[PDB]
Amino acid sequence: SVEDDKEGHLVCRIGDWLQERYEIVGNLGEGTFGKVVECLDHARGKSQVALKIIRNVGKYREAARLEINVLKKIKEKDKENKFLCVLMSDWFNFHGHMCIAFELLGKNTFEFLKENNFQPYPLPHVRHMAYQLCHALRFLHENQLTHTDLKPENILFVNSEFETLYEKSVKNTSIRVADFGSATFDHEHHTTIVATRHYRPPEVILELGWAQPCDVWSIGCILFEYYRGFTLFQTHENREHLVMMEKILGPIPSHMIHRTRKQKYFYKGGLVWDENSSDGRYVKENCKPLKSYMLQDSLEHVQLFDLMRRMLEFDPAQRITLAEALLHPFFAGLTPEERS
């Protein structure tokens, strides 16, 4: 009544069941880890879930068990569900397949941006999404947890039904934070390489140790991307990425240069970088001081850029915390509806 293919995926398709409770009604994508299927939960109101079905492969089974354990601790600290994390509704071991059920939500903030032709979110939408992202991660950070992999693809709209205006505009900017697979408690082993390239802070690139400030850097990057529709750091190499940071944000703190094992990036305390090369000319022409990317010069825009610069502080010990970010004057622009 159950089988696996040669990769250890669960053989299944639309119409199948699990646990005499989940009825598979759609495909939501695959990965190295296994499958995600849209299911009706017949033990709820035939309510829609995303069900992640992990391969019958040791290393994926164990990675899923650690993710479940994280999701269980978040749940215990947020019973009331106030801090805007994607809801884990159930989990089970199905013949060696770890299965995790989540509340089905709408498009991720990246898919929505792509489908609007990368035309940026209006500032009031950036502000509401920023506020929820700060609120969600502040709660995790105060419970000794770092996400480590915040990116637009991991931030979901609760409903992504949009109005078309003379541009697509999402009707409701309520979001949830997903993908706790890499989340790390203060007392746990911190792996060396965290965050996706574009969202990765200097203290991770220089391997100087990381903690909650890692997520604040990622959020600064994400807010830039919501505001302009393109990524702040478009590079796949550490030495170029640090040069881009310097051109956009100012000089790297000399104590971070002194402490890094990666001395090869530096000569007499300066980044090794040939301004005259092809790559040199490209970075010169495309990576300007952060303020030069504002679209308007009214207060609301100035306030976003001031908050964003404090989220992109090189030194993680000087970087704004999310408890501080939530008091920033940028958030006075929220409606009384958004602010709760």
Ligand X SMILES: Cn1c2c(c3ccc(Cl)c(Cl)c31)[C@H](C#N)C1(CCNCC1)NC2=O
| Residue 152 binds ligand X, judged by CB under 6 A | no
Q: Which residues of 140-176 are buried (b: 16+ CB within 10 A; e: fewer)?
A: bbeeebbbbbbbbebbbbeebebeeeeeeebeebbbb
| Residue 107 binds ligand X, judged by CB under 6 A | yes
| Window 32-71: contact mask with ligand X (x via CB under 6 A) | ----x-------------x-x-------------------
Dist. CA 52–CA 27, nearest whole Å: 11
22, 47, 221, 305, 327 from 86: Cα distances, Å: 19, 15, 21, 28, 25
| Residue 112 binds ligand X, judged by CB under 6 A | no
| Residue 84 binds ligand X, judged by CB under 6 A | no
Dist. CA 231–CA 70, nearest whole Å: 29
Cα 152–156–158 angle (5° rounding)? 155
Residue from 39, 156, 183, 245 touching ligand X (CB under 6 A): that is: 156
Characterize the bridge pairing of strands 270-271 and 266-267. antiparallel
14 contacts 27 by C-beta, under 8 angstroms: yes
- In whole angstroms, the minimum distance from the beta carbon of 85 to ligand X comes to 11
Tell me the β-bridge partners of 184: 146
- Nearest partner of 256 among 315, 179, 180, judged by Cα: 315
| Residue 86 binds ligand X, judged by CB under 6 A | yes
Establish whether 28 is an annotated binding residue: yes
Please say which residue, 99 or 243, places its beta carbon nearer to ligand X. 99
| Residue 175 binds ligand X, judged by CB under 6 A | no
Tell me the β-bridge partners of 156: 108, 176
- The active-site residue out of 5, 149, 186, 279 is 149
- In whole angstroms, the minimum distance from the beta carbon of 178 to ligand X comes to 6
**CB-closest chain residue to ligand X:** 105
- Look at residue 48 and give its three-state secondary structure: strand
Active site residue 315: no
Size of the site for ligand X (CB under 6 A): 13
Please say which residue, 181 or 253, places its beta carbon nearer to ligand X. 181
Establish whether 330 is an annotated binding residue: no
Residue from 37, 70, 74, 105 touching ligand X (CB under 6 A): that is: 105
Number of H helices and E strands in the chain, helices first, is: 11, 14
Please say which residue, 102 or 226, places its beta carbon nearer to ligand X. 102
Could you list the residues known to form a binding site for ATP, using ranges: 28-36, 52
Q: Which residues bind ligand X (CB under 6 A)?
A: 28-29, 36, 50, 52, 86, 102, 104-108, 156
Q: Which sequence positions are flagged as catalytic?
A: 149
Could you list the residues known to form a binding site, using ranges: 28-36, 52
